[PDB]
Amino acid sequence: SVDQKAISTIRLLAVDAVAAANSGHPGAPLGLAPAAHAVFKKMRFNPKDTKWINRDRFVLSNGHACALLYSMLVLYGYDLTVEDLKKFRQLGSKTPGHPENTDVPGAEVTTGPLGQGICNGVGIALAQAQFAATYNKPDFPISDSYTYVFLGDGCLMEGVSSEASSLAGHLQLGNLIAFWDDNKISIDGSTEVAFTEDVIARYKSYGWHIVEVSDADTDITAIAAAIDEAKKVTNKPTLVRLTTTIGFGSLAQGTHGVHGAPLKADDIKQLKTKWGFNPEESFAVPAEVTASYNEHVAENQKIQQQWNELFAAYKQKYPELGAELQRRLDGKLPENWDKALPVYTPADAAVATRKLSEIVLSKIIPEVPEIIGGSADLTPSNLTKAKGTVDFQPAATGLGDYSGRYIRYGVREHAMGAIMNGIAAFGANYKNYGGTFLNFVSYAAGAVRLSALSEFPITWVATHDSIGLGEDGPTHQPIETLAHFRATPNISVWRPADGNETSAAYKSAIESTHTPHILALTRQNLPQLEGSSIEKASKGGYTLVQQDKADIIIVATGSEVSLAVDALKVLEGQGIKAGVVSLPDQLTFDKQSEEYKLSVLPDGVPILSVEVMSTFGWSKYSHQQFGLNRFGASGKAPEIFKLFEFTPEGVAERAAKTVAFYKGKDVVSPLRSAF
Amino acid sequence: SVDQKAISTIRLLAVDAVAAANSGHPGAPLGLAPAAHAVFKKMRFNPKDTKWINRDRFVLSNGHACALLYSMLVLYGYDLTVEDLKKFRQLGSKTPGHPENTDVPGAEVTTGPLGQGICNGVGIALAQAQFAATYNKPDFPISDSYTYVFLGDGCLMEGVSSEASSLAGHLQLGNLIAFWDDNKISIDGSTEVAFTEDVIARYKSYGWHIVEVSDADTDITAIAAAIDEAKKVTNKPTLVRLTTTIGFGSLAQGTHGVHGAPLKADDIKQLKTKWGFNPEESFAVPAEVTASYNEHVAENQKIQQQWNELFAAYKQKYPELGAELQRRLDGKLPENWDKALPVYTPADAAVATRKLSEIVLSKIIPEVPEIIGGSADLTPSNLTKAKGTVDFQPAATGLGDYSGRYIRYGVREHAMGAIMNGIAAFGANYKNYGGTFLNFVSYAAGAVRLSALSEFPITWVATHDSIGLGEDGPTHQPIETLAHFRATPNISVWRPADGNETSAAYKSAIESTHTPHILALTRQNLPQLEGSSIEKASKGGYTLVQQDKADIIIVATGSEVSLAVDALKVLEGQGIKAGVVSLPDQLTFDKQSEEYKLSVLPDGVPILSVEVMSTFGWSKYSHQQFGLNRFGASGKAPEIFKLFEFTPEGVAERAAKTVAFYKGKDVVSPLRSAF
Ligand SMILES: CC1=C(CCOP(=O)(O)OP(=O)(O)O)SCN1Cc1cnc(C)nc1N
Ligand SMILES: CC1=C(CCOP(=O)(O)OP(=O)(O)O)SCN1Cc1cnc(C)nc1N
Ligand SMILES: O=C(CO)[C@@H](O)[C@H](O)[C@H](O)COP(=O)(O)O
């Protein structure tokens, strides 16, 4: 049949791509081709408009199987061709060894690190539910799309997928349909060696619906029926168990050897001849397959055309909601939204930056509907919920509604991070955030790095940033954390010192379109600084206190800026004149002009950094570094600062030693380099 | 009764400790005191010998509840007193806000970061099973101890505990008995808001046995009976559901407000009077409670005395095993074990450091019985299993035996990391390791940081260290990872360049008693270096190529040392004389004498670092840094190196620019500082 021919075409494109690269993973593509064919035939999508907001989304969570995804995209006429398949895994190609949303048309997210994609799918589905609750009206199903996810055994072993699956079941996300490639083979061999749990029983315990397809190597009728069944269960996410043979058709089918290496050439020949293809030919695309797939594309394009007319009619019937929706689909924030950001003066009271963050959120959430977010069971500590908002919950619970804006993630940092990526991936200008303690952002490093690589504008509201948290002690006090994330490409790491800087940090985080943000916020109160403003802090680094005859400049962040200002006064009594630079975001600063940066960190003056955590990275901006390169302590925070000499006198002593160390030396800016 | 009085004493000590600190968590201690009393009465332990190898172990995974643990330790006469309880959460005390194994007698592990302790308990139980299988003989139950773990709802939400619980069920760890504090309250309020899964059904799906105690606020008879029942089920770990009221007895019992803040003074008064205590008194310890607890201690000490005689008789009956066991309990490796480490010369073939690591393990595992380890489903890629070893599995599976040495962790990096901590915590000189790709060590950051804080000598075998892995692409290629872990206190991060350096890295990792190791290893082949040795590499950094008239020194690690040596030859043709330093472990280097370090990185010469990942940290050792501060690419590895100019010519160009940049300048060692 043409369907059988399509499945063979998919299988053979994937195997031929792996063969051409002499690298990659043929097994899961061979096993999952029937399911991929069946699912894409049920999906609504436009290969010529990858951003249609009412498309069904597909996520390949088992990203190593990407030769399968690329084959589907090529067959359906996305902006990806057989010539791109021939360049699978080759430097600079559009067919990298794991899918990248920035590079691959039709890749919704970046997968490859196991466990992530299913969580991303939870986030896409969460966003779709929130979006539909916000915009749909009687006779106006603006959003009614599904989220389809393929996943393997490795994904099911990773704890992040358990977190997201527990939460998705709690949230009754009925438009999520996941498919488990139940092939009983991982890299170490049989799943009997390490993975003998009853997966189906576990998913039932989370509140998922289950459909089992016992012969998923061939039974596309049953796979299609499973999708229909899943669509009838509107209050549970569904897991479809696809019992497959890894490498189906290969001489080496059902073995670990077909997971992750190219097939032998003789194996590929017998595959082709068993399926009616020419064993002398590679990258074959039968025209009948193209015709069949084109018919589905044409039907989908008519569906999108009708959706566009529905949207036009919606804008007439619901003028304000329609304009809001249009603005969001154009990727634009509300005009002058930032006028809602709070502004402070030096006469205002001292406030913890966690509380300043609460106040910002309270002002901007009512003004910017595309902001949603939550906390990982730290709502009353992170201060992440605006008063007067309702939680995102299924209405059946009585605890919220899908129109809600605040997500109770539970104690699930890693899944929160990956769900945030999925919410961003949904689109519609979502600007979403997640709160935890800064030290526990590290639990989510797998997802955070993918936010950076995927260029998603997500925001971590990361409170309790340092030893300033006090009594909870060294298991809670960050040391390495900002160095880790600052060393990751494309992460804005804001550590605001005061009210104006906190508003600048949020301005950056909400305006972002391609850069994730981490906001490192304090438990303890900090004073409003003389010299701070949103304008200056928006440059990432700025001169807080200018001293034309400076003997030293102190560069600091966060809670240490006020410390530096106090040290300047001690130094004045020692006959040393200091300037102060505040560096609330190193990435934003780095992006400023060379001349701007040199105006902040000039030649001809020693520069000392002060920040109560690792000194890594700080030599970019300073000659000497005063930091904390050991673990913390359990005690009242001011006593810990005193112990480690993060006091005005301790900073002054080190500043004076710095001045003395550079006596008789020629000093150039830390910004200078040889290459 | 005296048991009732003991429970009240525990509750009130915990509440009074929180009150004195005006900080901490009274709720779970109040709810769990009956269970703590019952479990400690069943446990075998010696407060005067915390390291007795056949003790039962207790782990408080819900570490915020540590006022409960400290109260138990004080009542049982560990080296912790009521005066220490009065200093709960105070700077420098023995009663920090979360338990620390380095600081607190009777704290087996460091908990506080949720999810970790249950995984640590899995590791303690895994080690006990392996240890018993290795040493027990007929009439010689050298090891027969249990592992008791308390955990809360937050622990059950964290994905790491799902990973470890799936694995523990697979491994049939019948001496693990965990207790869930089923109080339905977390920080964000009711568990109905985010945690509605059927926990018991999930644990059954993992192959755990379940006991439910419906009235755990009072029914210590049922808690004791649950332990007896769990001990009869020898092939399944057991979860005991303790249905409790958070803050039991408080006016605010059953509310989130009692989770994490001190009780009101009037509340504490009514607690005391309801339980027969003096509301005017704090830190009361009724002598009858002390007497009761002392009787159990005395009985346990007689049990240990008998164990010591059993051990003496074992050494007579089994002389070789007995001497091995004695050596391990003394914390000593086999005499001259390191003579098994492979040694290479520059005439030997190029080898990937992953393969060199395989070869080391193959030589040392047969010589050092206390080495065990595994991989997170990457055994044939990490090369972590010695040929001729058997896997650690329950014999009932037919797939291994508990005497086995190789653990199939599955795709569970985070739990692997926390299980490794538990294996180390067991003691008996275990030197245990875990393999994954370096980029996915990041999935386990929560546990890795705790290895460092807890001072456990665990080892990560972290292969595929860079863009040198090639085609899998940027989702797999580390950039930030070594900076992250190097910035963490107390982590040795070895990046060996060749065979001799790889042997030095293992010498360090296996000899370690207080410092975790990460071994960053290559996919690709590297040459054996002229000038390397175990002796020199054991210093962490050393002069590989000495040049007395150097214009520049190039400092490098791993795969970039050979690159630096090739660049030296290009530079010679440009009239520039270079030296080369190899820096296989920055931590070990830092610990050398000032004079040694200055012999490697002298004054008076520019120093350029070369390492194909983040430049963070490198200014400690260099004036200029050539690194990779962007994400990688999917392609053949040599083409990626060429793209980023990590070539002999690219390094030489930057070296020449460095020499030119310092012309006419006075240069001092990067090791110098102002303070
Ligand atoms: C173990 C591992 C894989 C086995 C999958 O086994 P699986 O899901 O059962 O896939 P299969 O049916 O055999 O093709 S892929 C690559 N990876 C290394 C790998 C490890 N950890 C993380 C976080 N991401 C990864 N990418
Ligand atoms: C959420 C959070 C807690 C709630 C526990 O809730 P729970 O287990 O149900 O405890 P309970 O019965 O209410 O006392 S503690 C502190 N913590 C912050 C916290 C967050 N993430 C990590 C990894 N470790 C933590 N320590
Ligand atoms: O991490 C934990 C305990 O392991 C939480 O219970 C925190 O102790 C608490 O949220 C801190 O509260 P505040 O810092 O907001 O007072």
Ligand SMILES: O=C(CO)[C@@H](O)[C@H](O)[C@H](O)COP(=O)(O)O
């Ligand atoms: O991470 C994955 C895929 O996401 C594994 O399948 C690796 O691709 C494989 O283990 C690399 O193998 P070698 O580098 O040992 O050839």
Ligand SMILES: [Ca+2]
């Ligand atoms: Ca599989």
Ligand SMILES: [Ca+2]
């Ligand atoms: Ca609880």
